[PDB]
Design a protein around this ligand. Structure first.
Ligand SMILES: CCCCCCCCCCCCCCCCCC(=O)OC[C@H](CO[C@@H]1O[C@H](CO[C@H]2O[C@H](CO)[C@H](O)[C@H](O)[C@H]2O)[C@H](O)[C@H](O)[C@H]1O)OC(=O)CCCCCCCCCCCCCCCCC
Ligand code: CLA
Ligand code: CLA
Ligand code: CLA
Ligand code: CLA
Ligand code: CLA
Ligand code: CLA
Ligand SMILES: CC1=C(/C=C/C(C)=C/C=C/C(C)=C/C=C/C=C(C)/C=C/C=C(C)/C=C/C2=C(C)CCCC2(C)C)C(C)(C)CCC1
Ligand SMILES: CC1=C(/C=C/C(C)=C/C=C/C(C)=C/C=C/C=C(C)/C=C/C=C(C)/C=C/C2=C(C)CCCC2(C)C)C(C)(C)CCC1
Ligand SMILES: CC1=C(/C=C/C(C)=C/C=C/C(C)=C/C=C/C=C(C)/C=C/C=C(C)/C=C/C2=C(C)CCCC2(C)C)C(C)(C)CCC1
Ligand SMILES: CC1=C(/C=C/C(C)=C/C=C/C(C)=C/C=C/C=C(C)/C=C/C=C(C)/C=C/C2=C(C)CCCC2(C)C)C(C)(C)CCC1
Ligand SMILES: [Fe+2]
Lengths: 32, 31, 45, 430, 37, 50, 309, 35, 34, 78, 61, 31
C-alpha cells in the first residue's frame, strides 16, 4: 500500500509547510 | 341555519369577551 | 465475525488523544474560570 | 508588520478592513488572491485529469473543469469522444506555474513593497475619492476584458474552432466562419423575457450567436475603456453615487451576485454553451429523453401512444413531462416539424444514434443526493447549487457593504451621536 | 490518467486541490501567533 | 409561538445593534461599552419611531 | 425649491408621514395592494383550478365548499409550466381562472413588494441616522419566501410545485416535498430547525433575565445568575455582543435553510442512509432511516397520479 | 385584451420611471447627518 | 490553592474518563470488517 | 481554600506525568474492550454473524412480558 | 528518458518547497530583504530554469 | 352561512389591525 503511505506523507509535509514559516518568524523575532 | 349551536358558540365567544373588554376600557377612560 | 484488524495504531492514537485532551481541557476551563474568580471575588450575593 | 486594533479601530475578525487606505498592501492582497484562484484551477484540472477514464463520459465521473476545456474543442472528436488528454494536462500545468508567479508577486507586495503607492509611484497610486484615477483603472480592466473576449472569438474563428453540439450527426469541433453580428439578433436576447419558452439569455442555441455576442462585447468593452480613460464622470454621476472604496465594493458585489444567479440558470438550462455529452443532460432533457425512449420502444414492439397538445396548440410529449415542452436538443430537432413533433418523422425518421443518446440520457437524470448515491449527482446540479448559494451570499454582501458605505459617507456609521439625535428634532406622533 | 512520464507523481496531485482551504486556516494561526492583537 | 419567538429575537437584536449610541472613537462598536454603564446603550426613541 | 417635482420628492421622502413611503414605497404599495386584493378576492370566490393539468380541478375557495384551514389559492396549472401567464395572454377570463393565473399574479407582486420592503427598511434607517443593517436581518425571511415561491418551481420546472397560498396547502407542500427530497435529513434543514429552536430559547431566556433585572444592573446583576446557572462565566458580558448574537443566530439558520431548499430545487437531496447497515451474508438490517424511507415511499406513491384521464 | 395590456404597461412604466428619477434626485445628500 | 480532590476535580473527571474510554471504543469500532 | 487556577496545573509537572501515562491506559482499555469482543457479551449486542439464527430468519419478537427473560434468552440463540 | 525528467521534476519539487519556506521568512525578517536579495533572485532563476528544462525534457518524452 | 362568518371574522381582524395602527394611544411615555 505504498500509494496511501506516500499520499499521507505528502499531505503531512504540505500541512507542516505552513506553520513552519510562522514558527520560524516567531522564533527569529519577525514582524508577523 | 347550519350548526346552530356552533353559531351560538362563536357569537357568544366573540361578544362576551368583547363586551367585557370594552366595558373595562370605558370604565377606566372616565378617570 | 467482528474483530479489530489493526494492531499498533491503538497506542499511536492514544498518545495523541491524551496529549491533545490535556491541553484542550485545561485551556477553556481557565478562560471560563478567571471571570468566575473575578465575579465571586468581592461582589457576590 | 500588521497593525493593532487601537491604532486602526478594526478588530482581528475585520482585519482586512485596515487595508482600505494602504494601496500597496491592498494590491499585494489582490495579486495573491488571483494567484490562489489560478492555483485552484490548475490543481483541480490536474486532479480531474488523474482521475479521468476516457472511455466513460465526463458526466458519469463528477468532472466540472474538463468539460470547460472540451467545449473549446481541445482533444475532442465527433460525438464527444476524447482523442487525447494532453491539452488538459498542459492547461493545468500552465495554470499552476502562473499561480506560482502570481503568488510570489502578491506575497512581495504584501510584505516588502511600499504600504502606499501614491508617494513614489504616482501612476499606480490612487485615492478612492479621486474620480479620474479610478475611472482610469476601470478603463484599463475593461480593455483587458474586451481583449479576452476577442481572444475567444479569435480561437473560435481561426484556431481550430469550438465544439458545436448542433452539427449534423452529433456534435463535433467546427470553425464558425460567419458569426452573426446582426444587432437585432444579438441584442434581442437581452430584451427577451426571462420566463418559460423565452429564456432571457439562456436561450442562445447556436455558436454563431455566441461568437457574435462576444465580438460585440469585446468591441464595446474596448470602446468603453478608451472612453473612461479620456473622461471624467458627469455632475449627475457625481451626485448619484457614493465615491469610496466600500461603495465600489458594494457595486461589484451586486453585479457579481447577479452574474452568479445567471450562471446558475445558464448551467441548469442551457445545452449549447454546456453541451450535454460533457456536462450530462438537463432535467428537461432527461424527462424528454425518457418519454422519447418509451415511445420508440413501444412503437418498435408494437404494443400516438403519449402525445398531447400544448396550450398553444403544438404537439408535445404527454404525461408528467408536459411541463418540459420548451426543450430543444441536437437529438430531437430533426424530429420536430413546423408545429411540434411530426408524426411521420417520429414514426420512420429515427436514426440509431438519436435513440442511443436518448437511452443514455434517460438513466442519468439530474436526480441525485448530497450523499451522492443516486436517484449520482449530475455536474449541472453541483454547478447550479453552488453558484446559486454564492450569488445569494454576494447579494447579501452587497446589501451590507452598500448600507455601510452610505452610512459612513453620511457620517453615522458608528452610532447615534447621543447629543443631537435626529429623532428628537422631529414632530411627535409620526 | 496523467501522461505515463508523470505517473509516479499521482499521489501528490491528489493533495493539491485541498491546499487553498488551508490558507484561510493559516491566517487564523498567524493571528493566534500575535495574541489576536 | 416558536416562529414569532425567532422573529422577535432577530428583530430585537438587529434593532439594538442598529440604534447604538456613538460612545467610542473606533469603528468597532463592541468595545464601546462596559457593564457598569449608567444609561442604556441603544436609543429607544429612534427604534420606536423606526 | 418650489417646483412641483421638488415638492413631490419632499413629500415622498418626508419623515413626518404616519407611515414612511420613500421610493421603495412608491414601487411596493401598488404591488402589495394589488397582491392582497387579488388574494382576498380569489380566496373568497375563485373557481376550481386545474393544478395537475389533467382536467381534474382542485377547489380552494371559500364559496366552493371550504373553510379557513382548508382554503387556499391553487398554484398555476402544470400545463403552463414556467410560462408567463398574465390576464391579457389568456384566451378568456374563465380560462385564466381555470389554469390558475391569480397565483402567478399574487406571487410576483408579493415578491416585488417584499423586496421593496427590505429596501425601504434601509431607506428609513438612513433618513433617521440609524445604522443600515436591519435589511440584512430581514433578508432571511425574504430569502426563504423567494426560495419557496420562485426558486423551487424554477428548478423543478413548473409553478404547480410552488407552495399554495393556504394552510392545508402548506402542509401538502411539506408532505410532498419530504416524499420527493427527504428534507428532514438535509443538514441545512437541521440548521434551520436549530436556528428556530435556539432563537425561541434565546428570546425566552433573554426576556427572563432582563425582566428579572429591571427593578423600580441590566447586565452586571443578571450575569451573576447566568454565569453560575449553566456555567459559561463571561460568555456574553456586553449588551451589544449579546444582542448581535441574538440577531445572528436565527438569521443565519434561516439563510441556511433557504439555501437548502434552493439546492433541493436543483435537487441534490437530503442524506440517504437506506440499506447502510448489512450483516454477514449480505442481509439488510433496518435502521430508523429505513422506516423514514418507508414513510417517504408511501407519501410518494400517493402523490403520483400516473393514471390520469 | 389589448386595452388591459396597454393600461398595465403604462402604469408599470410610470411607477418605474418615478422610482428611478427619485433615486437620481440627489438621494445621498438628504440625510440627518451633516457631512 | 493546595487541596485537590475538590468538587471541580470530580466534576471534570466524571465526564473526562468515560469520554476517553468511549473514544477508544469508537476508534476500535472503526476498524471492523463487518 | 481558593481553588487554584488552571494555569498553575497546566505548567505543573506531576499533572502531566500522571496524565501522559494514565490517559493512554484508558484509551487502550476501550480499544481492547471493543476488540476482544467483551462489548457484545456485556451489552448483548449480537455479532454480525449472529443476527439471524439457524431456526429464525426474521426479526425477533418478545410478545411476552413476565417471561421476557426466557424469551430473550431463546431468541438471542444462547 | 523518463528517469531524467522524473528526477529533475522531483528536484523542482524540493527547490520549490525550500523557496516557499524561505521567501516569506526572508521578507518578514527585519532588515532581511535587502540582505538576501541575491540569494532570493538566484533561487527564483533556478526555479524558472528548472521549469523550462523539465518542459523541454517532456517535449522529448 | 359559514363563508359569511369566516369573512366577518377576517374583516374584524383587519379592522382591529387598522385601528391599532392609526388610532393608537400616543406614545409619550418615552419619546
Ligand atoms: C426581472 C426580474 C427577473 C426575476 C426572475 C424571474 C424569472 C424566473 C425564471 O424562471 O428564470 C428562468 C430563466 C431561464 O428560462 C428558461 O430558459 C430555457 C432555455 O432553454 C432552451 O434553450 C436552450 C438554448 O441552449 C437549450 O436548447 C434548452 O434545451 C432549451 O430548453 C427555456 O426557455 C425554459 O422554458 C425557461 O424556463 O433564467 C434566466 O433567464 C436568468 C434569470 C436569473 C434569475 C433567476 C433566479 C432569481 C432568484 C431570485 C431570488 C434570489 C434570492 C434573493 C434573496 C433576497
Ligand atoms: C495587479 C498587478 C500588479 C501591479 C499593479 C503591480 C505594480 C507594481 N509593481 Mg508588482 N508584481 C506583480 C504584479 C503587479 N505589480 C506580480 C505578479 C509580480 C511577480 C512577478 C510582481 C513583482 C514585482 C517586483 C519584484 C517589483 C514590483 C514593483 C512594482 C511597481 C513598479 C512597476 C514596475 O516595475 O514597472 C514596470 C512597468 C512596466 C510597464 C513593465 C511591465 C511589463 C509587463 C509584463 C508588460 C505589460 C505591461 C503593459 C503596460 C500592459 C500592456 C497592455 C496591452 C496588452 C494593451 C508597481 C507599483 C517594483 C516596486 O517598486 O515594488 C513596489 C518591484 O521591485 N512588482
Ligand atoms: C487570502 C486572504 C487574505 C489576504 C490576501 C490577506 C492579506 C493581508 N492581510 Mg489579512 N486577514 C485575512 C485574510 C487575508 N489577508 C483573514 C481571513 C483574517 C482574519 C483571520 C485577516 C486578518 C488580518 C489582520 C488583523 C491584519 C491583516 C493584514 C494583512 C496584510 C499583511 C500580511 C500579514 O498577514 O502580515 C504579515 C504576516 C506574516 C509575515 C506571516 C505570514 C507569512 C506568510 C506570508 C504565510 C504564507 C506564505 C505562503 C504559503 C508562501 C507562498 C510562496 C510564494 C512566496 C512563492 C496583507 C495585505 C495586516 C495588515 O497589513 O493590516 C494593515 C493586519 O493588520 N489581515
Ligand atoms: C497599465 C495599466 C493596467 C493594466 C494593463 C492592468 C492589467 C491588469 N490588472 Mg490592474 N491595476 C492598475 C493598472 C493596470 N492593470 C492600477 C494602476 C492599479 C492600482 C494599483 C491596478 C490594480 C489591480 C488589482 C487590485 C488587480 C489588478 C489585476 C489586473 C490583471 C487582471 C486580469 C484579469 O484576470 O482580468 C480579466 C482578464 C483576463 C481574464 C485575461 C484577458 C486576456 C489577456 C489580457 C490577453 C493576453 C494578451 C493576448 C493573448 C494577446 C493580445 C494581442 C493583441 C494586443 C493584438 C490585469 C493584467 C488583477 C489581477 O489578478 O492581477 C494579477 C487584480 O486583482 N489590477
Ligand atoms: C465594468 C463596466 C463598466 C462600469 C462599472 C462603468 C461605470 C460607469 N460608466 Mg461606463 N461604459 C462601459 C462599462 C462600464 N462603465 C462600457 C462597456 C461602455 C460602452 C458602451 C460605457 C460607456 C459609458 C458612457 C458613454 C458613460 C459611462 C458612464 C459611467 C458612469 C455612470 C454609471 C452609468 O453608466 O450609469 C448607470 C446606469 C444608469 C444611470 C441608468 C440605467 C437605467 C436603466 C433604465 C436600467 C436598465 C438597463 C437596461 C435597459 C435593462 C435591460 C438589460 C437587462 C436585461 C440587464 C460609471 C463610472 C457615464 C459617465 O459618468 O461618464 C464617464 C457616461 O456618460 N459609461
Ligand atoms: C470580494 C468580495 C469581498 C471583499 C473584498 C470584502 C471585504 C471586506 N468585508 Mg465583506 N462580504 C462579502 C464579500 C467581500 N467582503 C460577502 C459576499 C459578504 C456576505 C457574507 C460579506 C459580509 C461582510 C460582513 C458582514 C462584514 C464584512 C467585512 C469586510 C472587511 C473585513 C474582512 C472580514 O470580514 O474579515 C475577515 C473575515 C473572516 C475572519 C471571516 C471568515 C469566516 C467566514 C465567515 C466563513 C468561511 C467561508 C465558509 C467556508 C463558506 C460558507 C458558505 C458556503 C455555503 C459558500 C473587508 C473590507 C467586515 C467589516 O469590517 O466591514 C467593514 C464585516 O463586518 N463583509
Ligand atoms: C409599480 C407597481 C407595479 C409593478 C412593478 C407591477 C409589475 C407587474 N405587474 Mg402589476 N399592477 C399594478 C402595479 C404594478 N405592477 C397596478 C397598480 C395594477 C392595477 C391596474 C396592476 C395590475 C396588474 C395585472 C392585472 C397584471 C399585472 C402584471 C404584472 C407583471 C407584468 C407587467 C408587465 O407588463 O411587465 C412588462 C413591463 C414593462 C416592459 C415595462 C417596464 C419598462 C421599464 C422602463 C423597464 C425596466 C426593466 C428593468 C428590468 C427594471 C409585473 C410583475 C400581470 C402579470 O401576469 O403579473 C404576474 C397581470 O396580469 N399587474
Ligand atoms: C499573505 C498571507 C496570507 C495569504 C497569502 C496567499 C494566499 C499566498 C498565495 C500564494 C500562492 C498561490 C503561491 C503559489 C505557489 C505555487 C507554486 C510554488 C507552484 C509550484 C508548482 C509545482 C511544484 C508543480 C509541480 C508539478 C506539476 C508541474 C504538475 C504535476 C507534477 C508536479 C506535482 C511535480 C494569509 C491570508 C493566509 C495570512 C496572512 C499571510
Ligand atoms: C454574450 C451573449 C450575447 C450578447 C450579450 C450582450 C449584447 C450583452 C449586453 C449586456 C449589457 C449592455 C448589459 C448592461 C447592463 C446594465 C446594467 C445592469 C445597469 C444597471 C444599472 C443600475 C442598477 C442603476 C441603478 C440606479 C438606481 C436605480 C439608483 C439611481 C441611479 C441609478 C440609475 C444608477 C448573445 C445573446 C448574442 C450570445 C449569448 C450571450
Ligand atoms: C503543492 C506543493 C507545494 C507547495 C504547497 C504549499 C505552499 C502549501 C501550503 C500549505 C499551507 C500554508 C498550509 C497551512 C495549513 C494550516 C493549518 C492546517 C492550520 C490549522 C489550524 C488549526 C487547526 C487551528 C485551530 C485553532 C485555532 C484557530 C487556535 C485556537 C484553537 C483552535 C484549535 C480552535 C510545492 C510547490 C512546495 C511542491 C509540491 C507540493
Ligand atoms: C510544463 C509544461 C510545459 C512548459 C511549461 C512552461 C514553459 C511554463 C511557463 C510558465 C510561465 C513562464 C509562466 C509565467 C507567468 C507569468 C505571469 C502570470 C505574470 C503576470 C504578470 C502580471 C500580471 C503583471 C502585471 C503588471 C505589471 C508588471 C506592470 C504594469 C501593470 C500590470 C498590472 C499590468 C510543456 C509545454 C513543455 C509541457 C506541458 C506543460
Ligand atoms: Fe434586550
Amino acid at each position: 500500500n505504498i500509494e496511501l503511505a506516500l499520499t499521507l506523507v505528502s499531505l503531512v509535509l504540505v500541512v507542516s509547510a505552513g506553520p513552519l514559516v510562522v514558527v520560524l518568524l516567531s522564533a527569529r523575532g519577525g514582524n508577523l | 341555519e347550519v350548526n346552530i349551536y356552533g353559531l351560538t358558540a362563536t357569537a357568544l365567544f366573540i361578544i362576551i369577551p368583547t363586551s367585557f373588554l370594552l366595558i373595562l376600557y370605558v370604565k377606566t377612560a372616565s378617570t | 465475525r467482528a474483530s479489530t484488524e489493526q494492531t499498533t495504531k491503538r497506542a499511536m492514537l492514544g498518545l495523541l488523544a491524551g496529549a491533545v485532551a490535556g491541553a484542550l481541557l485545561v485551556a477553556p476551563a481557565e478562560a471560563i474560570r478567571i471571570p468566575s474568580h473575578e465575579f465571586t471575588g468581592g461582589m457576590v450575593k | 508588520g500588521g497593525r493593532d486594533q487601537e491604532t486602526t479601530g478594526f478588530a482581528w475578525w475585520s482585519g482586512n478592513a485596515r487595508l482600505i487606505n494602504l494601496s500597496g498592501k491592498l494590491l499585494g492582497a489582490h495579486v495573491a488572491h488571483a494567484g490562489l484562484i489560478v492555483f485552484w484551477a490548475g490543481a483541480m484540472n490536474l486532479f480531474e485529469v488523474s482521475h479521468f477514464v476516457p472511455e466513460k463520459p465526463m458526466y458519469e465521473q463528477g468532472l466540472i473543469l474538463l468539460p470547460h476545456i472540451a467545449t473549446l474543442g481541445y482533444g475532442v472528436g465527433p460525438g464527444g469522444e476524447i482523442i487525447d488528454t494532453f491539452p488538459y494536462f498542459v492547461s493545468g500545468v500552465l495554470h499552476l506555474i502562473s499561480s506560482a508567479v502570481l503568488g510570489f508577486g502578491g506575497v512581495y507586495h504584501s510584505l516588502i513593497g511600499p504600504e502606499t503607492l501614491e508617494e513614489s509611484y504616482p501612476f499606480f497610486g490612487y485615492v478612492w475619492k479621486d474620480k479620474n484615477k479610478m475611472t482610469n483603472i476601470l478603463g484599463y480592466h475593461l480593455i483587458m476584458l474586451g481583449l479576452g473576449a476577442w481572444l475567444l472569438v479569435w480561437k473560435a474563428m481561426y484556431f481550430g474552432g469550438v465544439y458545436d453540439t448542433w452539427a449534423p450527426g452529433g456534435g463535433d469541433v467546427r470553425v464558425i466562419t460567419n458569426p452573426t453580428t446582426n444587432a437585432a439578433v444579438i441584442f434581442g436576447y437581452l430584451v427577451k423575457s426571462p420566463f418559460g419558452g423565452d429564456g432571457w439569455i439562456c436561450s442562445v442555441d447556436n455558436m454563431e450567436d455566441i461568437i457574435g455576442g462576444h465580438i460585440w462585447i469585446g468591441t464595446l468593452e474596448i470602446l468603453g475603456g478608451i472612453w473612461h480613460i479620456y473622461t471624467t464622470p458627469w455632475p449627475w454621476a457625481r451626485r448619484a453615487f457614493v465615491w469610496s472604496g466600500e461603495a465600489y465594493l458594494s457595486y461589484s458585489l451586486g453585479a457579481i451576485g447577479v452574474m452568479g444567479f445567471i450562471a446558475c440558470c445558464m448551467s441548469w438550462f442551457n445545452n449549447t454553451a454546456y453541451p450535454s455529452e460533457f456536462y450530462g443532460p438537463t432535467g428537461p432533457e432527461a424527462s424528454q429523453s425518457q418519454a422519447f425512449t418509451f415511445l420508440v420502444r413501444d412503437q418498435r414492439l408494437g404494443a400516438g401512444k403519449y402525445l398531447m397538445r400544448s396550450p398553444t396548440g403544438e404537439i408535445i410529449f404527454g404525461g408528467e413531462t408536459m411541463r418540459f415542452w420548451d426543450f430543444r436538443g441536437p437529438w430531437l430537432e430533426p424530429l420536430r416539424g413546423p408545429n411540434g413533433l411530426d408524426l411521420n418523422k417520429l414514426k420512420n425518421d429515427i436514426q440509431p444514434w438519436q435513440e442511443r443518446r436518448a437511452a443514455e440520457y434517460m438513466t442519468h437524470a439530474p436526480l441525485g443526493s448530497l450523499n451522492s448515491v443516486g436517484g449520482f449527482v449530475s455536474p449541472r446540479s453541483w454547478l447550479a447549487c453552488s453558484h446559486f448559494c454564492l450569488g445569494f451570499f454576494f447579494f447579501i454582501g452587497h446589501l451590507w457593504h452598500a448600507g455601510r458605505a452610505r452610512a459612513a459617507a453620511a457620517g453615522f456609521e458608528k452610532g447615534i451621536d447621543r447629543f443631537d439625535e435626529p429623532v428628537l428634532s422631529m414632530r411627535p406622533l409620526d | 490518467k496523467l501522461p505515463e512520464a508523470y505517473a509516479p507523481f499521482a499521489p501528490i496531485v491528489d493533495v493539491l486541490p485541498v491546499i487553498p482551504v488551508f490558507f484561510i486556516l493559516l491566517a487564523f494561526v498567524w493571528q493566534a501567533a500575535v495574541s489576536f492583537r | 409561538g416558536v416562529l414569532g419567538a425567532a422573529l422577535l429575537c432577530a428583530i430585537h437584536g438587529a434593532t439594538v445593534e442598529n440604534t447604538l449610541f456613538e460612545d467610542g472613537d473606533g469603528a468597532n462598536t463592541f468595545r464601546a461599552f462596559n457593564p457598569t454603564q449608567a444609561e442604556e446603550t441603544y436609543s429607544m426613541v429612534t427604534a420606536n419611531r423606526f | 425649491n418650489s417646483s412641483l417635482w421638488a415638492r413631490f420628492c419632499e413629500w415622498i421622502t418626508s419623515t413626518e408621514n404616519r407611515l414612511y413611503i420613500g421610493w421603495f414605497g412608491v414601487i411596493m404599495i401598488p404591488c402589495l395592494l394589488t397582491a392582497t386584493s387579488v388574494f382576498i378576492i380569489a380566496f373568497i370566490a375563485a373557481p376550481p383550478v386545474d393544478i395537475d393539468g389533467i382536467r381534474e380541478p382542485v377547489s380552494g375557495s371559500l364559496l366552493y365548499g371550504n373553510n379557513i384551514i382548508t382554503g387556499a389559492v391553487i398554484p398555476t396549472s402544470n400545463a403552463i409550466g414556467l410560462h408567463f401567464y398574465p390576464i391579457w395572454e389568456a384566451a378568456s377570463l374563465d380560462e385564466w381562472l381555470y389554469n390558475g393565473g391569480p397565483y402567478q399574479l399574487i406571487v410576483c407582486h408579493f415578491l416585488l413588494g417584499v423586496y421593496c420592503y427590505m429596501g425601504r427598511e434601509w431607506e428609513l434607517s438612513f433618513r433617521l441616522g440609524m445604522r443600515p443593517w436591519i435589511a440584512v436581518a430581514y433578508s432571511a425571511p425574504v430569502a426563504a419566501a423567494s426560495a419557496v415561491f420562485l426558486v423551487y418551481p424554477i428548478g423543478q420546472g413548473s409553478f404547480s410545485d410552488g407552495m399554495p397560498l393556504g394552510i392545508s396547502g402548506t402542509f401538502n407542500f411539506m408532505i410532498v416535498f419530504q416524499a420527493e427530497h427527504n428534507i428532514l435529513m438535509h443538514p441545512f434543514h437541521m440548521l434551520g430547525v436549530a436556528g428556530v429552536f435556539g432563537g425561541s430559547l434565546f428570546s425566552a431566556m433573554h426576556g427572563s433575565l432582563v425582566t428579572s433585572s429591571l427593578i423600580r444592573y441590566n447586565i452586571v446583576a443578571a450575569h451573576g445568575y447566568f454565569g453560575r446557572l449553566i456555567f459559561q462565566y463571561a460568555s456574553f458580558n456586553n449588551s451589544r455582543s449579546l444582542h448581535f448574537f441574538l440577531a445572528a443566530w436565527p438569521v443565519i439558520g434561516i439563510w441556511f435553510t433557504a439555501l437548502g431548499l434552493s439546492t433541493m430545487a436543483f435537487n441534490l437531496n437530503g442524506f440517504n442512509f437506506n440499506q447502510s447497515v448489512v450483516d454477514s451474508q449480505g442481509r439488510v438490517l433496518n435502521t430508523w432511516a429505513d422506516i423514514i424511507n418507508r414513510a417517504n415511499l408511501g407519501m410518494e406513491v400517493m402523490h403520483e397520479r400516473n393514471a390520469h384521464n | 385584451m389589448l386595452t388591459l395590456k396597454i393600461f398595465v404597461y403604462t402604469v408599470v412604466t410610470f411607477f418605474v420611471c418615478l422610482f428611478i428619477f427619485g433615486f437620481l434626485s440627489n438621494d445621498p445628500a438628504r440625510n440627518p447627518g451633516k457631512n | 490553592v493546595y487541596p485537590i480532590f475538590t468538587v471541580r476535580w470530580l466534576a471534570i473527571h466524571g465526564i473526562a474518563v468515560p469520554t476517553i474510554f468511549f473514544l477508544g471504543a469508537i476508534t476500535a469500532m472503526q476498524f471492523i470488517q463487518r | 481554600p481558593v481553588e487554584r487556577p488552571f494555569s498553575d496545573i497546566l505548567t505543573s509537572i506531576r499533572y502531566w506525568v500522571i496524565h501522559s501515562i494514565t490517559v493512554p491506559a484508558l484509551f487502550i482499555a476501550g480499544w481492547l474492550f471493543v476488540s476482544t469482543g467483551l462489548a457484545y457479551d456485556v451489552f448483548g449486542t449480537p455479532r454480525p454473524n449472529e443476527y439471524f439464527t439457524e431456526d429464525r430468519q426474521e426479526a425477533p419478537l418478545i410478545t411476552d412480558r413476565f417471561n421476557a427473560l426466557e424469551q430473550v434468552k431463546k431468541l438471542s440463540g444462547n | 528518458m523518463t528517469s531524467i525528467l522524473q528526477v529533475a521534476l522531483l528536484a523542482l519539487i524540493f527547490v520549490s518547497f525550500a523557496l516557499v519556506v524561505g521567501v516569506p521568512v526572508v521578507f518578514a525578517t527585519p532588515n532581511g530583504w535587502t540582505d538576501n536579495k541575491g540569494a532570493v533572485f538566484s533561487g527564483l532563476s533556478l526555479w524558472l530554469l528548472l521549469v523550462f528544462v523539465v518542459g523541454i525534457l517532456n517535449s522529448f518524452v | 352561512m359559514e363563508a359569511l362568518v369566516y369573512t366577518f371574522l377576517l374583516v374584524g381582524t383587519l379592522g382591529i389591525i387598522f385601528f391599532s395602527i392609526f388610532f393608537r394611544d400616543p406614545p409619550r411615555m418615552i419619546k
